[PDB]
């Protein structure tokens, strides 16, 4: 459970700095989770780093949707126990739009009554959702791992008695939800890349973990060396 330490005047700059500090602390937890994941643990170090650098925002967004769903029935974005709000608190158009988009994903968790077991496998699929344009160092090992997790989700959904009569439709709704994460996450990253580059002028602070990740991720994304993987596109 990572706390935000939400202080200072309520400005967009100060809120973003608080969220970035929080995102850096959450990222320490994400790396520890990824490190012991079956299959991933076996990938070469450069590939493990590549995958986390492309999908960090997707992993944080999906975890935010889960917290929001579990703690507020997706009425608010539950960033931390001390930082809970939705788009209604946003005065700037872009920030309102990004919160509203995140709110809509969390509402899909309510629509589906997403289970913790589904969430756990789907989170792994997001870690494996973007690769380099020319693939990874161990592209075959990665492809086997990704296929195995897709099959794990499919089997869990279709075999569950809670889904009888509509399990294949549910599996396709879950994979459509994973595809919809690409659109939202691209928008969040565009905002993040902007505040990162304009950090001094905007007064938006970033912790060392994020400075290092964004510095490696941004040239990849800018050069078109980012291949998103879709289930339905």
């Amino acid at each position: 459970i990572v706390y935000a330490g939400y202080d200072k005047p309520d400005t967009a700059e100060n809120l973003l700095s608080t969220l970035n500090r929080l995102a850096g602390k959450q990222m320490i937890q994400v790396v520890k989770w990824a490190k012991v994941l079956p299959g991933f643990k076996n990938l070469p170090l450069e590939d493990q780093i590549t995958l986390i650098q492309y999908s960090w925002m997707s992993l944080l967004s999906f975890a935010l949707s889960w917290r929001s769903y579990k703690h507020t029935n997706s009425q608010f974005l539950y960033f931390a126990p001390d930082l809970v709000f939705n788009e209604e608190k946003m005065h700037q158009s872009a920030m309102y739009e990004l919160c509203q988009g995140m709110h809509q994903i969390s509402l899909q968790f309510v629509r589906l009554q997403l289970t913790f077991e589904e969430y756990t496998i789907m989170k792994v699929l997001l870690l494996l959702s973007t690769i380099p344009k020319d693939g990874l160092k161990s592209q075959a090992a990665f492809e086997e791992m990704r296929t195995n997790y897709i099959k794990e989700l499919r089997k869990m959904v279709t075999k569950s008695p809670n889904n009888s009569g509509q399990s294949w439709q549910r599996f396709y709704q879950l994979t459509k939800l994973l595809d919809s994460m690409h659109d939202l996450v691209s928008d969040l990253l565009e905002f993040c890349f902007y505040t990162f580059r304009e950090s001094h002028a905007l007064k938006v602070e970033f912790p060392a973990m994020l400075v290092e990740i964004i510095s490696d991720q941004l040239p990849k994304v800018e050069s078109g060396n980012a291949k998103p993987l879709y289930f339905h596109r």
């Binding site: 320490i28 790396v31 520890k32 990824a34 490190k35 170090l45 493990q48 780093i49 986390i52 650098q53 060392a208 973990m209 290092e212 990740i213 490696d216």
Partner: peptide
């Protein structure tokens, strides 16, 4: 030479 925080956490 100096390792990133991500590399440190993945290798510790």
């Amino acid at each position: 030479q100096q390792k990133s925080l991500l590399q440190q956490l993945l290798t510790e």
